[model samples]
Target: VTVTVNKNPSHTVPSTLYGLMFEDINHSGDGGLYAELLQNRAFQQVTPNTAAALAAWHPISNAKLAVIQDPSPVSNALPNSLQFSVPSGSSGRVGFTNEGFWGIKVDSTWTYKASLFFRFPTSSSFSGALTVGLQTNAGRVLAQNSTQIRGTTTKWTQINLELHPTASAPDVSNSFFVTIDGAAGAGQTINFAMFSLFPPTFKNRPNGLRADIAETLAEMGPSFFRFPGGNNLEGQTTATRWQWNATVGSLLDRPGRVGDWGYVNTDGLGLLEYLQFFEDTGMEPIMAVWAGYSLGGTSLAENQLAPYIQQAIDQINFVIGDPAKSAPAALRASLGHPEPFTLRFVEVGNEDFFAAGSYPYRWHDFVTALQAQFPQIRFIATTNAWNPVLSPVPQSYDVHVYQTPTWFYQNAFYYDGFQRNGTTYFEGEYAAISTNANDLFGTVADGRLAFPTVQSATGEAAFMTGLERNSDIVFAASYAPLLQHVNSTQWTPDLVSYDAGSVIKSTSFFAQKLFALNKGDQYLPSTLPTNGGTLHWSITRASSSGKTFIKIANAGSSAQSLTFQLTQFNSVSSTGTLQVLTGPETASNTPEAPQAIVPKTSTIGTGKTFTYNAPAFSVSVITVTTN
Candidate 1:
């Protein structure tokens, strides 16, 4: 087949085409990204279904449950702080044991950082040492350290403990606990709130993010990050909707919420941490704000929605507000980020197309109000209803897709058919749904490991080429449910999957990474033969770098030997590198073999009239030096 490259200056691919779409689904926040190692560190709710306190915390013989009240309060929101009653002369290590998200990962000799708020019931009557440590499930001490408290006033004090394990911690599964075994005082009780344990986070920021997962996302070279929901932003009810206030500040002050994904969320990966993520990874947030809609078929009336729309406006202010002049900026500065973050895009809701009539009014009202406050930013609708999105401006329309590999392969050029009128797309969520045969998630979907395969990755690559081809209409794109913890999952086919100690970047991840890194500055057009459902390719060029990229997706059973004529370029590199990701239909990445089918680079001969051989069932990006 012969493909002709049309050197045009009309269409340019969006620089923000590739990004990350993340939510708290599949234990993404609690067990996946939020750096807190211990699950119920706050001890606010005991039961998964009920908001009962002291549930996951177990007190030893020398201690009993106590709550701080009146003048002896650790935090107002946390009326349920875990107080240990270690009475005078109370002996034999007594403290609380916390079974982390699933198991505490003590992989190697590590530095464990923790903070515990400690105080007394009355005037200074306590004098002792408190030991904070990690022990294996087998009850063997893996690490231990203590802080000496000679005497405590009735006022609460936060004790920061730095612990080091003398030897490599055996990862037979670890658990965290704090004991008052060394206390020498009589009738002394220690009040504990916001007892957090962090095992070295990404960039070692006290802000907290599972280093493995955060760093994994960081390495993807994404341009933007769409966050905190697919359905997570809109709660089931008005009372449960994602309130930004609840997710900021101290973890103790921030109460938990009933997640739409059926579990409770600590909000540990709250507003501040989320923005901080953008700061850390150089990927700005495509902030998704709840506009008056909920997943539970509920919405605020137009008048009531005014407050909700105003909330969205305030949200933008919280990030961009001037610290010296704006109130919200001062609030942000108080949280340690005196500088404001720049936001380019703001999404309204998730799948609000189901709202039909209700969404239009909400979208209209939100647009009307937000324009008055944050007129500088572009707003993307979950479902575009107004002509503004269809206007000449580069506003985006959110498109989410989840289907089988066969479906994607068949619709590889789905966007090529879209009208180039207006309303560019932010493909906020998309994934070729499949479970990797070699994956460890046998616990999800009736013992099937839900990870993407090479077939799915190829389909994704083919579909993504369409995204690149229609970049004029498709402004930004991202994979859905970005992070998934292997031990617990509510959704399958997440891009990245991890457990307490291991992380596996799916084959689809490598495919997405390839496009993200090699995306072009201008959309160079290409006309390929109608190969039915097998062959796909996109020709794009970087004007500044003086390079051209030939991205090909061959989902065929036979290798495709195609000739590309770069007439626009005077010369092309005869010695160019072709980065290819190919494997069997069932090929995928697993914890055991993470690189089973990753992108591999090989030198390929290329010229002004060179043949680009796309392997069967593969995605290839050929880099060429061009004039």
Candidate 2:
């Protein structure tokens, strides 16, 4: 009944334990991760404002200033003047005398943080305050505040403001506005520049992490982010594909395109921005590149494919190339970054395997072409089709799985029997998609009620353990559809869910976080006796820290007692902390009721042989620290 662990582990625990899973799989594909999953919002459009007069109804300065009017009137003429004139009376009726302002209408229910710079003629001085307020559809103040502009100065200074619904504000619904009122200036010329607003977003969310959602992800201790997505990179057509060049620089100028998810992507979460996000999360970016084909049956002709292959080379160059280069590096500088980002892995194309007959041939061509260019970079193929043609291809292949929860539960030990040859495996995209779950192919609807009884949260814990035990063959693992919209979800039972302002981490999210944060340096030898309903356990040793983390999952109906015997490290004590996450049979996190299934921690004493009872359908992560 006791499981013993030897100290000073003879083998090294793999560092890729906390790796991510992605999809380039058929049917479900990469859109599940790219557009459908990651919430990178922003229409990525720059509409120029050319209208000179602002209507009383639309008083804000629109894109006219952005498009035709240049801030530096002398050096760079604005498309047209913002056109602000003061009224004759002391009660300055400074309205959008000309409805020429360009702004995207946003609801005020979410917190908005904005900043802009303003200037006035050197000869003008304003003694009064200018009112800035957001108006709801009902014409009531959702949020309002004012700033004092001293004697008009030609010099521009940045003004930052945070706006949230006020307690006294009326029903704040469908509200949007950015206005500047001339309260006292009877005859003064005012100018505004560089107006920007960000809905309360994830702190350091380079790709637009909702603030609450970011906090939830932080709690999960996510180790890696596989980005720019599968088919997201390889467009159906070459022009439609994700061209890294088109995504950088000014957000307004970037012309977004349609993604495999059937929506136009703003590319707001461009290449470099994704790297920044990884940095913030203390995780690595497992970059997936375009392998020269699109999901829509468009592909580069072998002869025409050379350019795409070169694009992949340049893509890597853009990420890891020395910044000392001239033209390419200059582009990097323009994006506010002069340094190169680090890249260790690069995957080619999405699910090229979906094409029955000619796919293998094309995949072979891509692998050969890419390897010739960047042989040192580890290339990941997106299929299991072994062939003499692919023998020379990359040494690693990505696998995808998405079916009924019962399917995943039944095949939970699928990896246990997987044979590892020279080629390694990466579970790029996987989830328990039962019939009742949301459509994995980007359909927006609640599938929760449909397949409610599929795999429970407990099943996910067990599935992850299978990957952990077989980490040697499985290089990296990540959950598919990492994110879902709380209101309009394309997929159900996602790791995290969010609306415009609020976010919640699912029970599955906690299960993954428990294993990732408490992972050790090496795998410890351990065995669990066969009892009943799905029980899984894994032990890893941290060499430098001299700590061992033991993870146990009980997916059965009855609680089970687990015994651990630690005799290897005589100098090390067995006392540590146990963090447990449990719920009443497949619990879920709702927007109104988040934290329904979160983790709780308690202390455990050190002993040579100790028996701890694990509750049924629960996950437990035990951290055994030592001196």
Candidate 3:
């Protein structure tokens, strides 16, 4: 194959093309990236009848543990508190231990922040150093700290402590323990609420993201962050939906909701924190607002949507509103960020195709009210293409697809045929999830991917080549289900998968990272691949730097040789950087073998015209400085 690249810019690549789509599925947030180590922290959204009320708490010594609704709770939002009673005959330190999200990884170099709200019901007279530490499942304390507290009977007293370890734990089988002197406080009962233990977070912000995962994502150089929800935004019921106001303010007040992803979202990674993450990572936010639809197949009546619409306005105001005018903005200002956050796109809903019947009204009502308030912000509709005609004609649409490798490879030029109307597209969520179409949403027992494989990555790369090629109509694109906690996953084939100890970068992760890092401002028209060819490529040029990037993917079983002819360049660099990610078609990066197949960087010969071999099941990027 001979590919010709010219200097004439075909189109400009969208700056926000490559980004992250985040939802709390697979413990991606609460126990995955929120930097909170303790599980069942506040016991929020859990009932006494269910075992989840005490999901992570285990008795230490003879302490009796129960999740109870206290009359005078720590905060109005959090009603259930852990009641720890020193049994009448207990003589040693007695309390409870938390097995953090399966296990906690304790490192010697970092200090862990531990805080909780506590009040004494039996005896305020009993006072002592409450021992909190990182302990092994075998009961060996690795990191220890003591917070002296005189428990109050009237109100909840917030106690904070820092634990530092002298040596790293052998493995991630660690638990956090909070114990009181059982002998001195025999028969005394204490109530605890909002327990939080955090490792050194990304940038060390309070209640921040986990450093390892955050840094891994930051390494991709994503231009935008689509956050807060996918399906998580739309709850099973209207009452349980994620509320923007409920997610802000003090941690104690941020009453977490029952996530649609089958877990309790500790809202600790709330609205402000998400904005801070975008700020810290130098990315803009693509925020989403609930549009009166729930996962339980229910939509709010048009008349009933007034409050929800106002709530959305409030949500947006919190991000970019005048402190003097909007109360939510004032709340944001009081929380240290007087300046509004950078937000451009506001997604009206997530995968509204499920509720397509009511989307016309939802779209009209939401876009009308929201656009009238924030006209500058682009509102993205989430329903299926051209279905249930909407009023106000949406300016942008969020498109999603999860398919097999063959489907991705066959549809490499999926967007090339799109009409260039005033409307644009955001490839909001997509992935090559399985080998067989029947197993696309099935379990691993079928043909579904447990982790992103070389075949999936190459197929996705083939599709991304088209996304980059159609940069004009396709404003942005992101792989779906951005993260997953390997220990407890609800979804498969996530872009990045991790455990408590470390992250396993999927083959697709490297593919996405390569495209994100090599993005250029201008798309250079290049020789097109055959309609059903197994080889695909997209050429782009960085105008300011005079660097041309050639991205290629080979989804076949055999290597293909290609010759590149530089048309409008007098000189090309003698040598350029070549980053290649290639492996066996089914090979994947698992937790046990993280580095099995990672992108390898090397220097390759380049000039006005050059020849390169595209490896099978591979994604490659070639960078050349041309004049």
Candidate 4:
């Protein structure tokens, strides 16, 4: 096998090349990214089809806590509130326990903030002070804050509790629990809205993200963030879709909706949070908007399209609109961030293919209205990649491919046949779903799962070569369902997996980081002699930076030693180190050995032309300074 490279090429690689796609599935946001710890903080997650709620909270006795559907003056979203009552003779020391997302992780010597919306009835009042403590499941207190908040208040009042874990507190424990002394006497039920808690977040922003997860995203150096989700962008009904209105304002007021991926979402990581996420990570938001299409197969009627379209316009305004001219922008300004975000791509709908031929028609109207209002902003279509490329605007088309590992290995050259820049493509959601020894997608006839494996990662890296080779056309690409909570997951083969204590970087994740971190300005042509072995490769160069990157994947079962004669280069040298990620095709990362499939840089050079060996089921990248 041989790979010959051309020193220079004319095609320019787009700066917006690699990104991340986030969906609500697999507890990616609520119990995953968002800093909030309490599960059913607002008591909104209820019994399906009924007002009766209380799933996370379990009874401890003494003090009675029942899910009550009492209306609050300010909390519009939380209809089902909590009623905490105490017995006359009892100390009222007992309260319910919230395990909280596989048990709360309380790091020692840290400060945590907790809040609860408290409502005291006009007729009844409490004299004694109540204790809100961060305790262990065994009832051992790590730290506690006492507040009297004792009054006969008429409406909802948000009370704050600060938790200070001493050095004596364990670094990690499932023992973390939040308990409060119930106000004495029955019939004086206090209504609670949002019971929220969070430790110091990334940069300590008011409503911020988990530092560990945020650090992982920052490490990716993403150019864009395709947000809200894929199918999550379109809900079962238009009312519950990714509505900016419902997802904004106060966490207490924002109506918590069940995610389309079949779990609850508190909207805690709301629109403003997402905006801050993009700004924090230094990534532009590739916003995915819901075009009059529903996951339940209802395409918008011609008569009903205008209002939603207007909503779309308002959504854009809420992001980067002028506060003086736009109401949504004014609302956004009031939310602590007065400056508008930089906006670019606005994708309409998610997988419009389900609507049959109606997608093209819907896209026309969406683009027409969007372009009329904001012509400077570009648009993206969630239709098929093979569909007609013509649109009202020069829109980017999203391509999603979830296939067996071998399929991607075979389609490595799929984009080589396409016209250069005829139409820009966005590989918005692509994953190699290889069946392994673990969790898989939805139940098949046999009920087997597709697990995360090295073969799948190599296959994805193999296909990614095509995207990089055609970087002129493939404007941006992001791995779908970026995060997963190991305990509760809907999708398998995610890029990153994490639990309460630690985060795991899968083989697929390493593959993405290898490519994204080594991005360049221009594409370099490479000639490869085809062999029986599954080998995929790509070459790119930074025109002004004088650096070159060569990425290759040995998607076979045997090792390959390659040597090449030097040509068209001003200088070449033996590199001190080369990044190599290798493992058995079936090897995967789990919580036990999360670093098993990690990338390691090694000394792999034999002078000019750089003779190197690619181990079986491996993806490697070599960076060289080229003048």
Candidate 5:
């Protein structure tokens, strides 16, 4: 294959082209990304009929634990409290432990923050020393701190403690617990709510993101983060939908909802935290607003849509409205961010294609109202491309697809036929999740991938070439179901996977990392691959630098040799950096074997005209100094 790169620009590459799509699926937020280590921290939305509300709490020293509704709760949002007691006339120490989202990683390198809201409901008060610590399941303490408390009445008192381990635990088989001196109160009980334990966060922000995962995403150099949900934004029922107002303010005030993925999201990582994440990572947000639609296949009645639309308006206001005029913005200001957050694209809903028949009203109502208030913002439509025809005609569209590797390879030019009429596109979620096209949505036994395979990454890389080739219209693209917790997953073939102990970067992750890290401002026309061919390539150049990037993907099972021809460059360096990620089609990086298929970086000889061979099932990038 002979490919020629021309100097003249075909189009400009959007800076937001490669980014991340995040939701709480697979404990991706609670146990997966949010820094909080303790599970069921607040017991929010836990069904009280059974012991399900006590999912993570375990008795210690025969301590009794029960979820009870407090007459004067710490906060109305958090009405359930843990009632801690012990056997009659119990001595020594007593309390309970929490198995943190499967397990907790205890590293001695940093300090952990522990907090709780507690009160004495009865007249009988007890003075005692309360102990909080990280311990092994076998009852060995790894780190602990004790604080004296003069137990109070009716009034709930917030206690904040810090525990620093002197040594790292050998594994993630650790738990966090709090105990009180049993001798202090032989027959008394204490009520506790909103117990939280946080390890050092990504940027030391309180109730922030897990550092390791946040750092991994930061390494990708992503430009945008689509957040606060996918289906998680729209609930199974209208009442359970993720409400922006409900997700803000103090942890005690925020009432978590049942996530679309069949788990309770603490909403601890709320709206402000997301904007903070964008600030910390130097990325913008592709925020989503509930559009009166639910994942349970119901849309709000046209007459019933006014409140939801106004709620969305308030939601947007919280992000960028003037504090003086908007109460939501005033709430944001009270939270210490008087200045508005940076927001560009506001999606009307998630996969509204599910409720397309009623989207005409939902879309128009949302856009008309929101655009009238914030005209500078670009509103993205969520229905299928130009279907059911929207009134505003949509300035941009959010497109999603989950398919087999073969589908991705064949549809590399999926957008090539799209007519350019001043509208843009956001490939919000695209992934090669299965090999069996016949049963793409079926289970793993039917060929759904347990982890991303080299073949799938190459397939996605092939599709990404088209995304870059059509960068002018394809403003952004992100692979989704972005993360999964190996121990518990509702979705598979995620870009990144992890357990309590470690992170597993899938082959697709490295493929995205390479593309995001090597993005250019301008697209340079290159010799196109044969239509529907197994090989694909895209060329882009940094506008202000003397460098050019050549991205190539070999989605076939055989190696391909190609000759690169560089024209219109005053000079071409003799050496450049080459990064290649390749492996057997079925090979994967898993929690058990994380380093199985990572991209390899090395210096390779380069010139105006050079010969190169791309490995089968591979994605490669070559960066050469040019002028």
Candidate 6:
């Protein structure tokens, strides 16, 4: 099939072409794409001793320093600051006390770095000793460190420790502890704050990506980030809803809460963090506020929804507020950030459509309230509102799809035929699942564990092409449950998979990256006349260099021949390069053998019109420059 390019067609670049679909939830600001997966109880960081593992985990919880009592304290100061007292005697020691403290679960062979902060009261000079140690579920101490805080120091001080286990710290179900022994005086009180631990994070390393997953998402050529999450943003209870304030400041002081994902969250990744993540990734944070509704089947009435609406206002203030004026801005400065982040998109609630009739009034109340305060902010409704009356008629609507690879393959051309209304679209959550097998078609199992599979990669490539061709209406898109554990698989076909001490990028990762990295600022006019085989091509001009980039996809089992003709420039130099990501038809990527399939760059010499062959069942992104 021959594809021809026309310099000037009767079409202009569409505004809804390219955007980013951020994968991170709450921004977590940690630069970790799998924040929730990392926080899972089974994923732990271990070293030779307790303190080091604790340091690496950076567990955020109030249980780090619980108050046993606060007697004989003044009322005003007591409730605010004075009442912040630890337990009397050795029992008051607040370190990793129970299994809950080690929120991450780990298997064999892991190491960690840990640290904690301690302080003495201002009124008196005191001396005390605290013992740090790691304990297993069997009550065995794997490692230990004891240190003493002496003299008259009223300010806070930090202590660093390391923990490494002799053998792979078996399924001991470990927890860390700090025990207080000798004290200077009976009335002398000690306070602890801001304990942090970090396991090997994805920062500065080659495979490690400190860049916002959203930025790479832009490489996927998505339009927006459908965030904070459905159940993640709206809690089951009023107190549990994602409260942005609780996440800031010292890790230890941040009040943690139960997550809908069946665990407690430190809220360490708050609103500002989300904004920063978005900015860092060169994507806009699609802020989702609590719409006075909880997942536990509770919602506020129209008249009673004022506080939550105001809370949304406060969230906005925190993001775009001037550091000099806003209180939240001031707090942000105190938390080591002075610059204000940006915001333009806002989502009211997550999956409110699941609530049926209750969603309309609740969503309407939220939209009416927020639009009144922040009229300029673009609002997106959760459910698909094709029917005018039932739909929220939001600026955009979120779409979710979860199916088998075969289903995705079969429906690869679904978006091509979709006749979108004026409203934009966001593929908020999508994945190919292999849950049950059909009688004739066989079982379509989850491909997350199976790496570098040609079937999965082919499906992903097809889906991506659909996204690109329909980029005009489908503003943004992303795969859901972005991260998964090698041992514990929740949702199948996640973008990235990880295990203790190892991580691997799925075939979908390469496919998404190829599209994103090659995407141009605006679309260009091109035509691929229907040929006898499965071949497709799209062209876009790079805004930076004015270079023409051609993206080609060949779904056939055999290589396809194509000719590229440039109509705009006379005798233009090609100097084009082809970056190809391909593998055997049925190959998959495994943790031990991750790079079985990947993208590689090759040069194509100059030509006004060039002849090239595309690999079978592969994606090729060709960059053509005019020098």
Q: What are the RMSD figures for all models against the true structure? A: 3.7, 7.3, 1.3, 2.8, 1.2, 7.9
**Candidate 2 vs 6: which has more TM-score:** 2
| All candidates: TM-score | 0.91, 0.75, 0.98, 0.94, 0.98, 0.72
List runs of model 6 lying over 4 Å from the truth: 9-113, 117-146, 150-195, 199-225, 237-239, 297-299, 323-326, 333-339, 388-392, 409-421, 435-452, 528-535, 556-558, 567-572
Q: lDDT of each prediction vs. the true structure?
A: 0.77, 0.58, 0.89, 0.76, 0.90, 0.57
In the range 1-627, model 6's lDDT, one tens digit per residue, is 666776653333343344433323322222244332223221121222234333323321222323222222112111111112333342334334434322333323444455655556554555676666556655466766667767476565778775555444555365555555432333445554444443443332211232334234445554445566757778878777877776655444455556565544555565655555555455666678888778888877778887877778777777766778778777777766677666677877887776656667777877877778678787877765554344346778777776555555556555666676777677776655442334212333423324435555655566656666566777766766555546544334566665433456777777766766677655665664233335666676665776767777665578888887775655455587888877776766777787788788988784777887888877788888642
**Tens digits of lDDT, candidate 4, 537-616:** 87788888857788888877888876644467777555634799888878889888888888888665533476668899
**Could you give candidate 5's per-residue lDDT for residues 1-627 as a string of tens digits?**
999888788888999999999999999999988888999999899865359989999988978888988777889999898988766778876889999988999998889999998888875667778899999989889999988876565589888999998689999898998988777767778889999998888988877999889998998889999987798998998999989988898887898989988889999989999999999999999999999888878888999999988999999999999999989999999998899999989999999898999999989888999999999999999999889899888999999999988778788898888999988999999999888888888898999999999999999999999999999899999999888989889988899888887898899999999999987899999887876888999988898986788999999999999899885678899999999999999999987789989889999898889988999999999999778
Residue 11, model 2: Cα distance from true site in angstroms: 4.4
lDDT of 1 by residue, 1-627 (tens): 888887674588777989999889988888788988877666553432233565456665567765434254567665555666766666677776777777788755568897788766655655667788888766677788887774545677888887776566555377788877635644665566778888888877775898889888977889998988878888999888898878888776787888898777888888888888899888888998898878879878887887787677767788888878777678899999988896988887778887766777787778777866777888888764443343223367788887666566678777777787766788899887744334433445543436788888888888888888888888889987798877777877789988788789898888889898888788887885363477888877888976778888886678888888877767777778889999888777876787788788988777878887677789899888776
Candidate 6 CA-lDDT value: 0.57
Q: Model 4: which residue pairs collide?
A: 136-175, 137-175, 440-450
At residue 78, candidate 3 shows an lDDT of: 91
Report the backbone clash tally of model 2. Answer: 40
Query: Between prediction 2 and prediction 3, which has the larger TM-score?
Result: 3
Q: For model 2, how does the per-residue alpha-carbon lDDT over 435-464 read when each residue is reduced to its tens digit? A: 443454433253442211213666667777
For model 5, the run of ten residues with the poorest summed lDDT: 146-155
Question: Model 3: number of clashes?
Answer: 0
Cα lDDT tens digits, model 3, 1-627, are 898887788889999999999999999998787899888899988996456799999999988888998888888889988888887776777888999998999999988889888888755677777899888899888988887777555477888889998689999999999988887777788888988898888998987999889999999989998988799988899998889999899887788888987898889889999999998989999899999999898899999999999999999999999999989999999999999899899999888989998999999999999999998999999988788788989889999999998788789888889899888999989999998897589988889999999999999999999899989999999998999998898889899888888988999999999999998899989899877778999988888988888999998899999999995777789999999999899999998899999899999888888999998899999999877
C-alpha RMSD of candidate 2: 7.3
Candidate 2, residue 93: the lDDT equals: 31
